[PDB]
Structure formats: C-alpha cells, structure tokens
C-alpha cells in the first residue's frame, strides 16, 4: 500500500533519496531514507533542569 501510494506521487518506490552534504557539497553514497515523522517536545526541557 505504501509502495503504490509513493508510486502515485513522483517519489521513489524504495523511499531512500540521495542527499547532498551542506558542508562539503558532495553526494552521499548508499541513499539515505528520508520522510515525514511526527515528533513531540517532552516536558523535560533544560530551562528547569540547569
């Protein structure tokens, strides 16, 4: 299902896209996977710990 949904778009089927380093500006071999992840900021920030 995820494969055919990616096929619906112009995204690659494997989900791994080649990334370029921002510092040196070259190509990263072994194409890294990249996507969209839902994340959360926990209630353990640094302002009440330090």
């Amino acid at each position: 299902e995820i494969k055919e949904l990616l096929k619906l778009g112009d995204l690659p089927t494997s989900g791994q896209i080649r990334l370029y380093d921002g510092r040196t500006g070259e190509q990263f071999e072994r194409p890294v996977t990249v996507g969209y992840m839902y994340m959360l900021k926990l209630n353990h920030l640094v302002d009440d710990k330090m």
Partner: protein
C-alpha cells in the same frame, strides 16, 4: 576596587569579564558526576571549555564509563576549590589517567556504535569499484584520490 564593584560588574555581564573567565577556566578542571555511581568511574575530572547554551557537552566515548545515555540524563558538576584538590583531580581523577576498569584490565575506552560502524564501512571492501586494481604510493595520496 571592592567586592561590591566586582559583583556589580559580573552581574552587568560586560565583555571584559569573558576573557577573565577564559583565563580562570584555562587549566582549572571540574568534577563531573553521574547520578547513580556504581563504581569510581561515575565521578571523573575534565577540563572545561565554554559553550553557548544551557546543556553540558560531554565527550561521546566517556559516557560508556558512566553507562549514561542521552535520553534525558542529568549530571552533576563540582569544583575542587583547593590547590591540592585541583592538582589531585588533574593527577588521579582525570579521564586520561583512568582508561582501564577497576574490575577488569580491559580498557573502558572501547569505541561506541557510531565510530565502529564508520570504521567497518571504511574497512569493508567490495570486489569491483572505482579505482579497482590500481596502485598508490602512500596514505596521503590515497586520501587525496578519495577526496
């Protein structure tokens, strides 16, 4: 001139106080400590370097001595405040002087997952790639060819 003037200066947070801090924390080691201290390695000595923010930057490898992950741990830090204590922390409790575990002679400086994975990728060789079967004159020329 007086202690009140110095207090007003350090609370004003000017620029002539930062070089004084860099000078006084040039060779004054502090004592880092993990919350649970099973063995002696839970308390070590380290030379502090000023960083910008609110967290404590730690060497990645030495965490294996504390068994301390980066999932939200809280470490304590202390100061010797004594010439004898500073010299002792530099002599004995320093991380460089503590490389072998007190239980086993094996080093506690074993590399972690990232560096070992990087080195395994660097050493694992295929059968056919760019520059296969050529000859090189030295490691520097090899690094240049790779770059």
């Amino acid at each position: 001139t007086t202690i009140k003037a110095a207090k007003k200066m350090v609370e004003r947070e000017e620029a002539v106080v930062w070089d004084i801090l860099d000078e006084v924390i040039r060779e004054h080691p502090v004592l880092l400590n993990r919350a649970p201290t099973l063995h002696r390695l839970g308390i070590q000595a380290f030379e502090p370097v000023l960083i910008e923010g609110k967290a404590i930057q730690l060497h990645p490898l030495v965490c294996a001595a504390y068994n301390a992950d980066f999932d939200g741990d809280q470490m304590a830090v202390h100061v010797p405040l004594t010439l004898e204590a500073q010299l002792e922390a530099r002599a004995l409790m320093m991380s460089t002087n503590n490389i072998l575990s007190p239980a086993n002679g094996e080093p506690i400086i074993v590399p972690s997952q990232d560096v070992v994975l990087g080195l395994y990728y660097m050493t694992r060789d295929c059968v056919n790639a760019k520059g296969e079967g050529m000859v090189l004159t030295g490691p520097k020329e090899a690094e240049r060819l790779y770059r």
